[PDB]
Design a protein around this ligand. Structure first.
Ligand SMILES: Nc1ncnc2c1ncn2[C@@H]1O[C@@H]2COP(=O)(O)O[C@H]2[C@H]1O
Length: 132
């Protein structure tokens, strides 16, 4: 699974750092998402972070709408270019209504301030049904 995501800042630009339980899940996620993106004719800025992490870089609007931006309310927002890439990525990340504003035919999600308030804020996913 995706174990954790982070709002980071890099060269004064918002990123989403995505962490994976392992290097193999990271690599596969990288190849699958990139492929789905290019099939949809999108250049989605997902790049290598580390052994077990990737980054979604900032959007370059209006030229390249794909990537992270700060919305006028100060939320981290991620434009996925097309509704189909959103549909593809979100479940694999585990991102849901409790995490973000996600809209029917929209291509952009908005993280709740009470969930990711600012730079270096973290959301950790822990597997459901696990001993507690
Ligand atoms: N900096 C940006 N990066 C990516 N998309 C943006 C940016 N600014 C505006 N948009 C898009 O324009 C849309 C206008 O409506 P929304 O605020 O719902 O969502 C917005 C994003 O999809």
């Amino acid at each position: 699974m995706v174990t954790k995501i982070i709002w980071v800042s890099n060269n004064g630009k918002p990123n989403l750092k995505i962490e994976f339980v392992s290097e193999e899940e990271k690599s596969n996620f990288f190849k699958e998402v990139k492929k789905k993106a290019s099939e949809l004719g999108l250049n989605f800025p997902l790049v290598q972070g580390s052994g077990n992490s990737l980054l979604i870089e900032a959007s370059n609007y209006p030229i390249n709408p794909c990537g992270c931006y700060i919305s006028p309310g100060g939320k981290l927002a991620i434009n996925f270019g097309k509704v189909e890439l959103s549909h593809f990525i979100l479940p694999k990340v585990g991102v849901k209504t409790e995490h973000a504003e996600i809209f029917k035919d929209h291509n952009t999600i908005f993280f709740h301030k009470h969930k990711l308030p600012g730079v270096n804020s973290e959301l950790t996913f822990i597997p459901t049904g696990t001993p507690v």
